[PDB]
PDB file of C-alpha atoms and ligand atoms in Angstrom:
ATOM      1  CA  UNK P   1       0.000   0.000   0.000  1.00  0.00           C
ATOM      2  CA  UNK P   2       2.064   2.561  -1.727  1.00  0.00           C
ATOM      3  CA  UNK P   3      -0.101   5.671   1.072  1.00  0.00           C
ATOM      4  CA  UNK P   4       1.967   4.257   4.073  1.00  0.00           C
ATOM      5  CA  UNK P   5       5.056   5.662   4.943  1.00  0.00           C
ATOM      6  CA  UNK P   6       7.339   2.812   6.022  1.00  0.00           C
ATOM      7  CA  UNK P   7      10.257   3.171   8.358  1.00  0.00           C
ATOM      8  CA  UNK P   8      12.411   1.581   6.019  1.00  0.00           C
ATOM      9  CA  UNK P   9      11.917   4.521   3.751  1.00  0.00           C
ATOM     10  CA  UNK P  10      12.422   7.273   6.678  1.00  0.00           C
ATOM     11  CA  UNK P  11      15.503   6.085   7.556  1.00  0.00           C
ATOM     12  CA  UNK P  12      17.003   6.020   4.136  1.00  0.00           C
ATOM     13  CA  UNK P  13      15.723   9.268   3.710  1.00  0.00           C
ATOM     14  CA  UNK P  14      17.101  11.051   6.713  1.00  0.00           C
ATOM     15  CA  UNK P  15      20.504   9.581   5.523  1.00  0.00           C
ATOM     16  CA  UNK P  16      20.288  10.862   2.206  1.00  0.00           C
ATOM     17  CA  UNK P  17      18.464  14.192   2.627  1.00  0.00           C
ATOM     18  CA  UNK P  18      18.767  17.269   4.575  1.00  0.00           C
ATOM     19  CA  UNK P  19      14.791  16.520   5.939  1.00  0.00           C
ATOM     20  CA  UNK P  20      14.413  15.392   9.733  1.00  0.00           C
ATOM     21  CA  UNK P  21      11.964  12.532  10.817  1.00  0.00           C
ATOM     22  CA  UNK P  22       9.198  14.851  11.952  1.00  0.00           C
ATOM     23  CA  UNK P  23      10.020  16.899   8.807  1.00  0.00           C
ATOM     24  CA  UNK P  24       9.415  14.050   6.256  1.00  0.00           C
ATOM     25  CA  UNK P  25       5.944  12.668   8.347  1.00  0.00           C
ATOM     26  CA  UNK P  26       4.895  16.048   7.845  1.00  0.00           C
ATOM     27  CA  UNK P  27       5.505  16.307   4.192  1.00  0.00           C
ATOM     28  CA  UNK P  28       4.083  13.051   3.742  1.00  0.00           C
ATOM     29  CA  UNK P  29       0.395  14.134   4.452  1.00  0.00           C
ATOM     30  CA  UNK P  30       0.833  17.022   2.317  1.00  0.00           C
ATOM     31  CA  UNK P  31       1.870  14.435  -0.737  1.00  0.00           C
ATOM     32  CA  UNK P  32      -1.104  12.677   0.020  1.00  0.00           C
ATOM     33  CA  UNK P  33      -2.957  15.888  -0.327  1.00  0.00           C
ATOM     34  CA  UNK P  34      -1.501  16.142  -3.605  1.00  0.00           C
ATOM     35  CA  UNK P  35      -1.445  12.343  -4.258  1.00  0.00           C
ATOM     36  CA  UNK P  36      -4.061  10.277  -2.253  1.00  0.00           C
ATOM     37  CA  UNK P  37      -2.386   6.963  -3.225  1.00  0.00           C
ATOM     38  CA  UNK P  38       1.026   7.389  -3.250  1.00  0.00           C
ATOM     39  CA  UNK P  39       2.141   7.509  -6.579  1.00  0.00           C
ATOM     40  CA  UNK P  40       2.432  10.398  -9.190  1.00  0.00           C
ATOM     41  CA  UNK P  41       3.008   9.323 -12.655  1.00  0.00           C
ATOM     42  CA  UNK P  42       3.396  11.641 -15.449  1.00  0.00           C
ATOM     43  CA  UNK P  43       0.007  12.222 -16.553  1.00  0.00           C
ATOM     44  CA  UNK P  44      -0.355  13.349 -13.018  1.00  0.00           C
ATOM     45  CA  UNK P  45       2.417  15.418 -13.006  1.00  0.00           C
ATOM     46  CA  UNK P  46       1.814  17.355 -15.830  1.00  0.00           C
ATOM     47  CA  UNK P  47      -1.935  18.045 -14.885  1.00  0.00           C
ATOM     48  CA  UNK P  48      -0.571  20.220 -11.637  1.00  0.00           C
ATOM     49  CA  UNK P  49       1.966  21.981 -14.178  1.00  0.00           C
ATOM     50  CA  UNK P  50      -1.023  22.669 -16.142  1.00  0.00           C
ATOM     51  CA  UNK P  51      -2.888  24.353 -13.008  1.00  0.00           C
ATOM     52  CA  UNK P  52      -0.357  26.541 -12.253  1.00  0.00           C
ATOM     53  CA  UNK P  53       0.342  27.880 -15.947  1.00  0.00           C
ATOM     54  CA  UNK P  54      -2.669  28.444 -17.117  1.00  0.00           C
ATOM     55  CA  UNK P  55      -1.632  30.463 -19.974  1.00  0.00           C
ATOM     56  CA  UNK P  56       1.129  28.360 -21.616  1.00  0.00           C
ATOM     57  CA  UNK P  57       1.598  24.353 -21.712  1.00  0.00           C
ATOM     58  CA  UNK P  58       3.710  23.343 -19.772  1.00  0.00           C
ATOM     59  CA  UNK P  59       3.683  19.737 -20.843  1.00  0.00           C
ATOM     60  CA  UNK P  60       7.404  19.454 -22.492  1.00  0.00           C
ATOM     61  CA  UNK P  61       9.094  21.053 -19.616  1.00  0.00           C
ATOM     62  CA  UNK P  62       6.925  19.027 -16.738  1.00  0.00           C
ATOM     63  CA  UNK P  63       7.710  15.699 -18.651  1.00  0.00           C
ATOM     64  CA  UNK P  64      11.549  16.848 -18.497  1.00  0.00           C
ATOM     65  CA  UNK P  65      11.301  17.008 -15.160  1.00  0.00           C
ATOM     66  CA  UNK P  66       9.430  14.144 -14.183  1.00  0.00           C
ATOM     67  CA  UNK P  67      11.785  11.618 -16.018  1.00  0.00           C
ATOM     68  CA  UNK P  68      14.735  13.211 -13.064  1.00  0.00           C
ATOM     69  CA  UNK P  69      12.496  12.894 -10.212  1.00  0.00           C
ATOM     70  CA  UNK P  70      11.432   9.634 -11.065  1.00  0.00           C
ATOM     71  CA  UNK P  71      14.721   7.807 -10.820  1.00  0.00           C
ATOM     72  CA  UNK P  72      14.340   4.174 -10.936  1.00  0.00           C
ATOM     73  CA  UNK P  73      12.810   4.601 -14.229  1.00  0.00           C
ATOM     74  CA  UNK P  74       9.123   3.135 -13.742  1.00  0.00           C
ATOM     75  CA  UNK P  75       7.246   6.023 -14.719  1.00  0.00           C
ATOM     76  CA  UNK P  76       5.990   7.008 -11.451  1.00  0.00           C
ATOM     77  CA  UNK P  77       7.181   9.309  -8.948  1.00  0.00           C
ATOM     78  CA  UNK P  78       7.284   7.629  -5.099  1.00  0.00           C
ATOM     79  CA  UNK P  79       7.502   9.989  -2.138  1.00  0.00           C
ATOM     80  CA  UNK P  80      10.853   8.767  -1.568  1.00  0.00           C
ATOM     81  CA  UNK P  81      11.656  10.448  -5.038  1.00  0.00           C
ATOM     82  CA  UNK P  82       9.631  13.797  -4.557  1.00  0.00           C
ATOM     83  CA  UNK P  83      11.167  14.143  -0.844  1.00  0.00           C
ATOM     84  CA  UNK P  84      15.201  13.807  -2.442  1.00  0.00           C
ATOM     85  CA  UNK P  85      14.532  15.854  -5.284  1.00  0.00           C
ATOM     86  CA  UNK P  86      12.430  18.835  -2.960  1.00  0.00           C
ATOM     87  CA  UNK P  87      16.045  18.401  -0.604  1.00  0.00           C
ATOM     88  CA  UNK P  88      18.444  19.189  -3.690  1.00  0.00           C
ATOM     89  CA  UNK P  89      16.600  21.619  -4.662  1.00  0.00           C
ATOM     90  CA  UNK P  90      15.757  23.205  -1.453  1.00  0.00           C
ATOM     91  CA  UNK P  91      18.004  22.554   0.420  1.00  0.00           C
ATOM     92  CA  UNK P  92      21.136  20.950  -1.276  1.00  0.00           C
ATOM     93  CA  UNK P  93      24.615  23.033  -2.095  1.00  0.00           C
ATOM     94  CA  UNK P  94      25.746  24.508  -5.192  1.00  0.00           C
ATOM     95  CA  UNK P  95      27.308  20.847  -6.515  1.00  0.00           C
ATOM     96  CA  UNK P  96      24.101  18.825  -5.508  1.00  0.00           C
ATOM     97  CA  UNK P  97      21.977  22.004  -7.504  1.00  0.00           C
ATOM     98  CA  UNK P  98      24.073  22.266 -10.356  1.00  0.00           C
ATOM     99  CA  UNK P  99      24.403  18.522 -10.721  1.00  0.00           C
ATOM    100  CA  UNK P 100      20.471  17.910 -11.010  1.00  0.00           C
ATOM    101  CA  UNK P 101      19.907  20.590 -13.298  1.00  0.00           C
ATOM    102  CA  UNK P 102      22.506  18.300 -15.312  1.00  0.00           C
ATOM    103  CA  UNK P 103      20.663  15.744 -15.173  1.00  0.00           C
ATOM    104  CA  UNK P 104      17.552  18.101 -16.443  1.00  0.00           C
ATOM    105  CA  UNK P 105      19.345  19.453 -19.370  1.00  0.00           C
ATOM    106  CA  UNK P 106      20.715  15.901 -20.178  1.00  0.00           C
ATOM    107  CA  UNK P 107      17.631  14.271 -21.851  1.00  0.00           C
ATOM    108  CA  UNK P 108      18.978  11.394 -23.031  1.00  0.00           C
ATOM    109  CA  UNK P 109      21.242  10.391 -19.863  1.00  0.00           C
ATOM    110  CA  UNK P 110      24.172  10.029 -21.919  1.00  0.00           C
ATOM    111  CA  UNK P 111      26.882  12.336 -19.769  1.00  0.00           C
ATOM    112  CA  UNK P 112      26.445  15.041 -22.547  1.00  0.00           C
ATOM    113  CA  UNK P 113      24.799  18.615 -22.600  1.00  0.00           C
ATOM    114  CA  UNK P 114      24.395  19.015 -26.673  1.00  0.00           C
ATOM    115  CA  UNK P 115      23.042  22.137 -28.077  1.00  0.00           C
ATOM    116  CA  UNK P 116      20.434  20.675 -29.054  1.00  0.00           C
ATOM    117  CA  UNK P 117      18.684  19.546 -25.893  1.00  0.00           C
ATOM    118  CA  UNK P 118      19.533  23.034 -24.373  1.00  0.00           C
ATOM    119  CA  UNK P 119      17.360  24.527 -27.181  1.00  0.00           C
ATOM    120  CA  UNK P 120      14.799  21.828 -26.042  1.00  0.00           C
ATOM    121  CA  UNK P 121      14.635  22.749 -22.639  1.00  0.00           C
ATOM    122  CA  UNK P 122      14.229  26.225 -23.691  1.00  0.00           C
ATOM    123  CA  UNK P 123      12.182  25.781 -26.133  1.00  0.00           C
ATOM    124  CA  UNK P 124       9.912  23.571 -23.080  1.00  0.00           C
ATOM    125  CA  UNK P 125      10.502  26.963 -20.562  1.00  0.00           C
ATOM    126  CA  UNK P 126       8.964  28.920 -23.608  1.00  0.00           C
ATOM    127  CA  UNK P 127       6.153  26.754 -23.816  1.00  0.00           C
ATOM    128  CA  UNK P 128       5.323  26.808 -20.822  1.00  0.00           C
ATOM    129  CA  UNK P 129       5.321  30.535 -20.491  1.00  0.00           C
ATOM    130  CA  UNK P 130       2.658  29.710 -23.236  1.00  0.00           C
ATOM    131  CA  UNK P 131       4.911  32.134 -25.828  1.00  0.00           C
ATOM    132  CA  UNK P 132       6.939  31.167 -28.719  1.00  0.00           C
ATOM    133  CA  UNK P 133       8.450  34.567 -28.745  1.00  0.00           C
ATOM    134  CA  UNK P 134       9.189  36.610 -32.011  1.00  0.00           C
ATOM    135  CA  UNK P 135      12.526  37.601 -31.622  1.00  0.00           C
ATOM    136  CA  UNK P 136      14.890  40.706 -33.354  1.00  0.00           C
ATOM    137  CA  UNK P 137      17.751  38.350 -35.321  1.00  0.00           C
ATOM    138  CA  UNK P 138      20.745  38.281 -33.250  1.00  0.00           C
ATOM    139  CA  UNK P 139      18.289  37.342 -29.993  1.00  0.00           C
ATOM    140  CA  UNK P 140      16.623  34.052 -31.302  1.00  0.00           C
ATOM    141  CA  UNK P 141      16.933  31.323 -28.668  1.00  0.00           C
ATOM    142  CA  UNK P 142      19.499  29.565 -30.741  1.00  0.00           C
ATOM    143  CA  UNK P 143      21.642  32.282 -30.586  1.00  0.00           C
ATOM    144  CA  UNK P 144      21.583  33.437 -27.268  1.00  0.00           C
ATOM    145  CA  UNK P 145      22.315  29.686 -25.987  1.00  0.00           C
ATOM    146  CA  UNK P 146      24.908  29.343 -28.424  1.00  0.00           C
ATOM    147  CA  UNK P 147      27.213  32.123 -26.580  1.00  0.00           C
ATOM    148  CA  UNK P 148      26.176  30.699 -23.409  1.00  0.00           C
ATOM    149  CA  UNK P 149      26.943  27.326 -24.335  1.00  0.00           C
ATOM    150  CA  UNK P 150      29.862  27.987 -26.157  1.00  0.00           C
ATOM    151  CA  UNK P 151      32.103  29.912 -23.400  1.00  0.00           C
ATOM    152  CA  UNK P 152      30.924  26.783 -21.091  1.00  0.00           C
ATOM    153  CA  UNK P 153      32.656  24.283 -23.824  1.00  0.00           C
ATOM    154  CA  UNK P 154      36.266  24.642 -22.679  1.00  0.00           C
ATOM    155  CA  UNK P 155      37.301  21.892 -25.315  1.00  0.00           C
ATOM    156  CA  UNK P 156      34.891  23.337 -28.437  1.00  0.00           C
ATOM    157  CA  UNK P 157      33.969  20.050 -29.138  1.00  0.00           C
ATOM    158  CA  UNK P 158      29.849  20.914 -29.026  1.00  0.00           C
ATOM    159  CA  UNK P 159      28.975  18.751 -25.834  1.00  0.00           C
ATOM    160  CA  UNK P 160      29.005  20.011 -21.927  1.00  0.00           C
ATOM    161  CA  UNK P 161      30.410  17.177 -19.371  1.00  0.00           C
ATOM    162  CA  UNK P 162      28.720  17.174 -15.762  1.00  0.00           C
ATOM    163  CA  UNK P 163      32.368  19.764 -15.103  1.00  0.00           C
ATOM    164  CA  UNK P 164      31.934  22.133 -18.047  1.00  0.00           C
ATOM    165  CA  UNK P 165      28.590  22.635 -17.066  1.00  0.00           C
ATOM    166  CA  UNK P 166      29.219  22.840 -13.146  1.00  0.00           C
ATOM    167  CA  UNK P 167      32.289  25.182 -13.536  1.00  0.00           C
ATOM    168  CA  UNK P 168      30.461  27.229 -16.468  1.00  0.00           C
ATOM    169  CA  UNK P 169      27.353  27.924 -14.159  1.00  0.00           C
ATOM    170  CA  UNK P 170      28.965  28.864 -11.784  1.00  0.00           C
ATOM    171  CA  UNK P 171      30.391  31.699 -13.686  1.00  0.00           C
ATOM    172  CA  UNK P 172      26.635  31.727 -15.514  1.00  0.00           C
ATOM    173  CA  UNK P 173      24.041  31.518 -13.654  1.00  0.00           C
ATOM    174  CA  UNK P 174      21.200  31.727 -16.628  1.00  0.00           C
ATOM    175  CA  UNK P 175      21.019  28.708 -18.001  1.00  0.00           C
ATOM    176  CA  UNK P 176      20.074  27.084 -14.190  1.00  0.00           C
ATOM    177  CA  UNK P 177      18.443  30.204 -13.303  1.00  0.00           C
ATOM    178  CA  UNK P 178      15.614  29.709 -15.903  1.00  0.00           C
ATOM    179  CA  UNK P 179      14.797  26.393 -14.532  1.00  0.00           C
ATOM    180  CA  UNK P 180      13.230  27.911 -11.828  1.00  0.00           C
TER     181      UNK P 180
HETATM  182  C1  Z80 W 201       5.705  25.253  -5.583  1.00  0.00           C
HETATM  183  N1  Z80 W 201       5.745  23.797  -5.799  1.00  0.00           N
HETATM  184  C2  Z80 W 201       4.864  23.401  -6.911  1.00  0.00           C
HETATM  185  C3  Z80 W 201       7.078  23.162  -5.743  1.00  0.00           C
HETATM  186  C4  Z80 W 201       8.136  23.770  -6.690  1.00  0.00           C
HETATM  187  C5  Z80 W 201       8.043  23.346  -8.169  1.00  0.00           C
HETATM  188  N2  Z80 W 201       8.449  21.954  -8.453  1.00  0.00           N
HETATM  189  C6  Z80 W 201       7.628  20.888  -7.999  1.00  0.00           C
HETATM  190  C7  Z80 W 201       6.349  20.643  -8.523  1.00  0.00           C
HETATM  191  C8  Z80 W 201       5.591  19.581  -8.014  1.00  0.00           C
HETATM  192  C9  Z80 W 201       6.104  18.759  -7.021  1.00  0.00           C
HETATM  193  C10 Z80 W 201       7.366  19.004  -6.502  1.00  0.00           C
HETATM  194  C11 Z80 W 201       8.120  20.066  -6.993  1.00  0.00           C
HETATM  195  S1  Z80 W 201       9.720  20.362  -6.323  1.00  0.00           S
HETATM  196  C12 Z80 W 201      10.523  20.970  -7.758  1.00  0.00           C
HETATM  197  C13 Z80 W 201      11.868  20.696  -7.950  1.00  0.00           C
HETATM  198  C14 Z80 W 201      12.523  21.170  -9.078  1.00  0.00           C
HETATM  199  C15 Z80 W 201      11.805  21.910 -10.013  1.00  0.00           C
HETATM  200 CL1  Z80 W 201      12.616  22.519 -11.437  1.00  0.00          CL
HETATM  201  C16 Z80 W 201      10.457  22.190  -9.830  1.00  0.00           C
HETATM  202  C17 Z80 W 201       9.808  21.703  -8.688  1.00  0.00           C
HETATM  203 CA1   CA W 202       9.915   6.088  -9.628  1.00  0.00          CA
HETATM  204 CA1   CA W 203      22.812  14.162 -23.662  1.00  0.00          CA
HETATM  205 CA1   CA W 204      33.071  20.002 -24.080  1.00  0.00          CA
END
């Protein structure tokens, strides 16, 4: 009965997360507020991204997201999931931070940023702002990643490793501050 929280689950959880026992029993009931059964699979997900942007779709960017919370891979997100992913993002330093948006930005798990799925996680922040904005030239979304992207690619050779991205954002911000 995925609604119960075990033990088991708290004590794992207090050893990988910055949440206390009393702190993760409390979150729990609000979950279940959120998720009467236990278990939030992407559908789900994307329905409370819909809510709260009303005037965009959100759907691209929420799916993005869901596939990092839900880290074993079985299409459903388990409190254990939501509570580590709310404590790196929350809570967690500047490494733990900067290595989930990683994981974000790196759709197909591979160990590579490419250009091409930072213009799709922009292009998901833009949908979900509900505006795929008109641009002057030299400000299309392309080209304002490219620059970005580029000075983070210390080698030039068009991908971003877990370091070129850490290091680069830290010097950056943007690219982790539109996440957000
Ligand atoms: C205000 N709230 C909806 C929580 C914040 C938004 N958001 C989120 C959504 C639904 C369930 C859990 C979360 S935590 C989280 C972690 C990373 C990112 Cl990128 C977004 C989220
Ligand atoms: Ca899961
Ligand atoms: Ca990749
Ligand atoms: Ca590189």
């Amino acid at each position: 009965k995925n609604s119960k929280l075990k033990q088991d689950t708290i004590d794992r959880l207090t050893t990988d997360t910055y949440f206390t026992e009393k702190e993760i029993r409390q979150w729990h009931k609000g979950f279940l507020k959120d998720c009467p059964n236990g278990l939030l699979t992407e559908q789900g997900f994307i329905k409370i991204y819909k809510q709260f942007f009303p005037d965009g779709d959100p759907s691209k960017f929420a799916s993005l997201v869901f596939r990092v919370f839900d880290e074993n891979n079985d299409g459903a997100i388990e409190f254990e999931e939501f509570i580590r992913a709310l404590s790196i993002t929350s809570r967690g330093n500047l490494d733990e931070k900067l290595h989930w948006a990683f994981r974000l930005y790196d759709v197909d798990n591979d160990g590579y940023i490419t250009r091409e799925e930072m213009y799709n996680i922009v292009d998901a922040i833009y949908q979900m702002v509900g505006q795929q904005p008109q641009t002057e030239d030299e400000n299309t979304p392309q080209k304002r990643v490219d620059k970005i992207f580029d000075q983070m690619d210390k080698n030039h050779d068009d991908r971003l490793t877990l370091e070129e991205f850490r290091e680069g954002s830290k010097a950056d911000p943007r690219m982790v501050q539109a996440l957000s």
